[PDB]
Design a protein around this nucleic acid. Sequence first.
RNA 1: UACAAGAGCCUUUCUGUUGUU
RNA 2: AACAACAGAAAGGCUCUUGUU
Length: 421
Amino acid sequence: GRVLQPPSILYGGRNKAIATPVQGVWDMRNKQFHTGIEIKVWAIACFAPQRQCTEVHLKSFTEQLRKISRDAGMPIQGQPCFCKYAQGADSVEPMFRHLKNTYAGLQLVVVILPGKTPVYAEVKRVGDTVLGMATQCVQMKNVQRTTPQTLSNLCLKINVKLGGVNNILLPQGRPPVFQQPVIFLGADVTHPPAGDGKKPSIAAVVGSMDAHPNRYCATVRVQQHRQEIIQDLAAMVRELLIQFYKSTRFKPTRIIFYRAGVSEGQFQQVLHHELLAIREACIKLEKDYQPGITFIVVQKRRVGKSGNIPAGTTVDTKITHPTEFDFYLCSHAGIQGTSRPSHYHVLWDDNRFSSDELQILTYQLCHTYVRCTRSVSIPAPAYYAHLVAFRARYHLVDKDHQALAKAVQVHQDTLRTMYFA
RNA sequence: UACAAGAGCCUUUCUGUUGUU
RNA sequence: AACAACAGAAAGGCUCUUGUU
Ligand SMILES: [Mg+2]
């Protein structure tokens, strides 16, 4: 159970501070964002009732959020140009298309949601596919009784939804594989509630762009009922590779794959299909174009108040397969309950990797998750695959067959935007 | 709908065993 | 083999309560 050193997280701003995570979580005090966005225009969308969420309390939340953000290196310049109340899921598309066609260069819409409602599903469906926006929805309990960590997490998600980098790793502390170009992919499938013959399954992959890996793009399609494999995975990887070359202008050499949402009992069939699928992904672009292929499937399955595993523990043997390159990583502290050391499986190893380098890469990727200043259980790309699969699940909702992947196809503006996080 | 948990609940289902014929 | 009801695991469904410096 080797606890790897957490990455000395590189922040920016006037100080260029470096955050060292202590016990798996680092504070955001006196740390400006590395690539923070000067937020030109932003919007406030209240769906909570005015009885239980007042204008003065919303303005207090806006002011204190702006203070936390200015301390965070992501400045919001002035009061929001849009601050409207609303209600109902059916009143989302007209209001969103009203706010798009009023403020040019619109960046972020903050949406206030009283708990669980179809308003979240319609808000995400309008923002990510129909119109092409970036939104940040938060509950009512976090806009009157707010904490510094709540506003910090809000600012963390807002900074990454708007094209910037919250925090790079150390370029001197990054693993040596970044000496050559790399791309990191993450895949996940969402199945509907069973007995739904008309509701299909969702296959979603995401891919990293830059050599300072904090930016991802998505590609999602719709597949048949209860299918744990992707048919057109090769087209997904090819489109992601094209987008890599288009947005970064340097030729990739390595390929990493982080498969998620796959049952344990039938790993061999999924391996057999998707490995060959990534192979025809590589050989259907140019002759002799072979990157180093590796396939890692990851499956979400003292210290602190709860007394749990410190964030960063790596297990390489004694519970693992001898010949197969599989290992466990527990990279999240136990806030309440127990922490679950994640399982990681690599059979395709032509990417030729040392072990310790590979769990260092996955641990720094876990730290690269942008929605919290703490390491998370499974890496950032497979998280973003999970949230984009759940996002397409919110996209395929009411308020065909497999010709409904026009409803899970992301807009052109948002196809670059890290909207799922 | 920040992160990490826990349980019960009834629907097709993955590993199969037992069983009147 | 199928057979109504099964023992669980794993993936996928809810719902809540357990807190941050
Ligand atoms: Mg999943």
